[PDB]
Amino acid sequence: MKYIGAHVSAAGGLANAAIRAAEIDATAFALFTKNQRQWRAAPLTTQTIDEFKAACEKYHYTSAQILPHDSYLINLGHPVTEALEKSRDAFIDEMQRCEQLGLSLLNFHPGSHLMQISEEDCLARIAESINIALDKTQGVTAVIENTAGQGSNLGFKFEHLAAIIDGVEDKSRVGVCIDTCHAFAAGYDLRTPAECEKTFADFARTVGFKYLRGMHLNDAKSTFGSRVDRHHSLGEGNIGHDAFRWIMQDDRFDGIPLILQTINPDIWAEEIAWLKAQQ
Ligand SMILES: [Zn+2]
Ligand SMILES: [Zn+2]
Ligand SMILES: [Zn+2]
């Protein structure tokens, strides 16, 4: 089985994310659990938590179908240690909100070296950040998202993901999410079925499908290897529709949230329906 949805809005409360997912016939969804703009969000209230759980139950979203995204302001590889510590505190808080909400996955971009430390040192800082969060929480898997590699962002090579995982002690609670736009922008081609297989064999040799915990299904406005992150609606960008059909027909992508972050929410229900029909 595949679980297919979108990163929907949590405006008016977290439970509305589940409602919005059901209104586009999603079988998965992503959301932010707080505003992306504060190192301290107010505590989740017992009512927010219960409304969210009640809506997930009403619309049949189990923990395995939901892929929250952390704030884009967190940098778990920050070269400045006081900033690193603020990002680690924020990340622990995000993981704890997932605990409270009954969520079992948390997707995040790994971090950025800001030209102040080496790639290896940054990746090690990121692995330690994950270890710290996993020591302070239970039941939530840290899902590392690949990136386009814009600026000093890491995680654009599959080897970066593997290097982080190698440094994580509790391998049972780390995994990865592959965003197709980010992969393409980083230089992993997806424009033909043969190129898709080549890219995913690379992923298999370097990371392995045992760590795959989510996908983000995005076409790309940016160009191949551009290292720019600009999504597009399915079929309208530089990747094209074939990659998405290929993914939908491959059983290695079963049982995990497959999340659109495409740029026109007015057509999400149609994109979800098209993806389901490609199976
Ligand atoms: Zn992301
Ligand atoms: Zn993404
Ligand atoms: Zn992106």
Swiss-Prot record:
GO molecular function: 3'-5'-DNA exonuclease activity; deoxyribonuclease IV (phage-T4-induced) activity; DNA binding; DNA-(apurinic or apyrimidinic site) endonuclease activity; endonuclease activity; phosphatase activity; phosphoric diester hydrolase activity; zinc ion binding
Residues involved in Zn(2+) 2 binding: 145, 179, 216, 261
Sites where the protein binds Zn(2+) 3: 182, 229, 231
Induction info: Endonuclease IV is induced by agents which generate superoxide radical anions.
One Pfam family, short name: AP_endonuc_2
EC number: 3.1.21.2
Assembly and binders: Monomer.
Functional description taken from the UniProt entry: Endonuclease IV plays a role in DNA repair. It cleaves phosphodiester bonds at apurinic or apyrimidinic (AP) sites, generating a 3'-hydroxyl group and a 5'-terminal sugar phosphate. It preferentially attacks modified AP sites created by bleomycin and neocarzinostatin.
Name the record gives this protein: Endonuclease 4
Lineage: Bacteria, Pseudomonadati, Pseudomonadota, Gammaproteobacteria, Enterobacterales
